[PDB]
Amino acid sequence: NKMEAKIDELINNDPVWSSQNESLISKPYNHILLNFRLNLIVQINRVMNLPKDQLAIVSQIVELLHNSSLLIDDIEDNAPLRRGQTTSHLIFGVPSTINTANYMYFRAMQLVSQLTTKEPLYHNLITIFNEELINLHRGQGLDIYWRDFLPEIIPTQEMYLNMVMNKTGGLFRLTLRLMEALSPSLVPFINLLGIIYQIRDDYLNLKDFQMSGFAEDITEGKLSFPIVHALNFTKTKGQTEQHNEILRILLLRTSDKDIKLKLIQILEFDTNSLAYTKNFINQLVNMIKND
Amino acid sequence: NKMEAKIDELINNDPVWSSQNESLISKPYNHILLKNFRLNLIVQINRVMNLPKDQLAIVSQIVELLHNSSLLIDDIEDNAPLRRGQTTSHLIFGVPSTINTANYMYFRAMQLVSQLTTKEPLYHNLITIFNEELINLHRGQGLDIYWRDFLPEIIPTQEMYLNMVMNKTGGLFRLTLRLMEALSPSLVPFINLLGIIYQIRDDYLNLKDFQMGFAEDITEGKLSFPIVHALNFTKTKGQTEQHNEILRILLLRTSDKDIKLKLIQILEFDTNSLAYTKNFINQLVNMIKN
Numbered sequence A: 001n002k003m004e005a006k007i008d009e010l011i012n013n014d015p016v017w018s019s020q021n022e023s024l025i026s027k028p029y030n031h032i033l034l035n036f037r038l039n040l041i042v043q044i045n046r047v048m049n050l051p052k053d054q055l056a057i058v059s060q061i062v063e064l065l066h067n068s069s070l071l072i073d074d075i076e077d078n079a080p081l082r083r084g085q086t087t088s089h090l091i092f093g094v095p096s097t098i099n100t101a102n103y104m105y106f107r108a109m110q111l112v113s114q115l116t117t118k119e120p121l122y123h124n125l126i127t128i129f130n131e132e133l134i135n136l137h138r139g140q141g142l143d144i145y146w147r148d149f150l151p152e153i154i155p156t157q158e159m160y161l162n163m164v165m166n167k168t169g170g171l172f173r174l175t176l177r178l179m180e181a182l183s184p185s186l187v188p189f190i191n192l193l194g195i196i197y198q199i200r201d202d203y204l205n206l207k208d209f210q211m212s213g214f215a216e217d218i219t220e221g222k223l224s225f226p227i228v229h230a231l232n233f234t235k236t237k238g239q240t241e242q243h244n245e246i247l248r249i250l251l252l253r254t255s256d257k258d259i260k261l262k263l264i265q266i267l268e269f270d271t272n273s274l275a276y277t278k279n280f281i282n283q284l285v286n287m288i289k290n291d
Numbered sequence B: 001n002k003m004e005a006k007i008d009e010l011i012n013n014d015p016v017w018s019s020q021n022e023s024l025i026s027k028p029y030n031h032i033l034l035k036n037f038r039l040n041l042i043v044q045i046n047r048v049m050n051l052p053k054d055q056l057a058i059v060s061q062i063v064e065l066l067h068n069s070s071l072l073i074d075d076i077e078d079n080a081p082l083r084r085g086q087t088t089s090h091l092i093f094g095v096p097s098t099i100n101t102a103n104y105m106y107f108r109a110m111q112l113v114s115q116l117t118t119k120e121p122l123y124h125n126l127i128t129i130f131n132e133e134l135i136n137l138h139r140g141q142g143l144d145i146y147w148r149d150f151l152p153e154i155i156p157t158q159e160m161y162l163n164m165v166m167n168k169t170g171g172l173f174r175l176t177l178r179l180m181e182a183l184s185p186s187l188v189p190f191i192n193l194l195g196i197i198y199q200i201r202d203d204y205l206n207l208k209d210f211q212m213g214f215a216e217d218i219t220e221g222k223l224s225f226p227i228v229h230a231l232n233f234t235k236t237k238g239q240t241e242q243h244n245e246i247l248r249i250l251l252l253r254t255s256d257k258d259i260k261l262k263l264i265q266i267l268e269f270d271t272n273s274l275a276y277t278k279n280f281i282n283q284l285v286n287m288i289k290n
């Protein structure tokens, strides 16, 4: 009698969700919340001319996707720090962080319908959202597979660049394409910026450590731009031993500074991968500065 | 020059993705596919919705993707070594690849949504349905995980547990049903009762199968239906030491057969929670039968 009634009031309503419940599961996200991406949206806008109301929502959407991606990336990469602070999954656990991060992807999708009331356009914005997230996951999927199944596949410079067009280019293209569709193409340019962004991120990760950083990419074992170069150069030049030692070090998932410094000096003096990467970056930057 | 030419051909094209790459990224999802009743429920419900087989195939594909992906993540979240007898994906391909593949399918599934209709309003409603229910799924799943991991900061009551279930399990049940009802040329209450019966029966069988089943729920330490009842029953009957012993076993995250038996025996002899649960499920099935 009273039970059947309670159950009947239950199944005949939307599920109950409290602001307290909301707060409790947003902890991993609130943690990572502690302007440049915002600055990038603004400069792009000096061309896209979106009104401030909309620029604002484009921003909220991009921050949510961006922060969610990092929460997950740190789980995927087993990173202990992000922005000099302890990583969310280590504080709240992998379970909550994965769920909160995926939760936010969906809150992000929800925000898209606050951009328009035009059914044709809205459909377009969603397809953009859907497409760049699909691309993001593909790049990230390759990067993780190459790394976790090494030495199964040794990627070439070409493969690495295609993985980067997907992985990083994904959110760059997403932001700009939403804006371009909202404007009352800068895709190639934004693609080049993402590539430069990723190769500089790979490089400085070792160059900072070498100069003084943690070179956490070595610990992770990633097929970074410098590593891909060193791995193919050594294969090509008959340096069997170096090629193997590079792989062994990546596969140690080591935190020892000396072992990391040894790998880095291999890329500096033996394969010349650091100079190569440095130069490749400049060449890319000049492709713009000489536009 | 030749370097610039290539970077140019690169950035002016769509990102390259091959069938082989698509294959690599799929390994974690395909592994869980080796595991018809879901399909039958769709078939059966359709005798009321009458969607054209073509359209019904996509809804089905969408549902299999959401369901499979959420199971891939659920195993990582519950630290499960097994799923229907086979080794779970994360233990074979790793947590990183399994998470990313599951997440990629969520999005592949979202894409299959616009292949359901081209009618613009109708499509908006389909996306909104998809969005709303995946949000609910994550909310309940998130609260279910919060209670377990923060235990014993919060011990839910039977009412809290039911609202977690309405979000957690009701999510994909309703997403399915609501999409069909929208594409049909309201069974929601019924589908809501179904998900609840399903989750309580799921929590129930996990202990029972072990009593007659590894009772992984004890190891996971979750606030299942019989456990919530036991916790609240011993608190109400002021049975301090039993209440505590239940919490202690759950916090052990134990694999020990003997310790697992003990908690189940506290639930059989002390609180009569398993029986209380059998009775709760039977009353729920009755609202449908009668």
Ligand SMILES: O=P(O)(O)C(O)(Cc1cnc2ccccn12)P(=O)(O)O
Pocket (backbone or CB within 6 Å): A069, A070, A073, A077, A136, A140, A167, A168, A201
């Ligand atoms: O951890 P960072 O900041 O160094 C890193 O750059 C993070 C990163 C790059 N690209 C993506 C795409 C989605 C999510 C995270 N992403 P990486 O690729 O090196 O993990």
Ligand SMILES: O=P(O)(O)C(O)(Cc1cnc2ccccn12)P(=O)(O)O
Pocket (backbone or CB within 6 Å): B070, B071, B074, B078, B137, B141, B168, B169, B202
């Ligand atoms: O692991 P199972 O199969 O026993 C389980 O039933 C899996 C389950 C139930 N409801 C959801 C919602 C989202 C993802 C997984 N879900 P549980 O709730 O016990 O994790």
Ligand SMILES: [Mg+2]
Pocket (backbone or CB within 6 Å): A073, A076, A077
């Ligand atoms: Mg990464």
Ligand SMILES: [Mg+2]
Pocket (backbone or CB within 6 Å): A073, A074, A077, A079
């Ligand atoms: Mg990382």
Ligand SMILES: [Mg+2]
Pocket (backbone or CB within 6 Å): B074, B075, B078
């Ligand atoms: Mg589970």
Ligand SMILES: [Mg+2]
Pocket (backbone or CB within 6 Å): B074, B077, B078
């Ligand atoms: Mg679970």
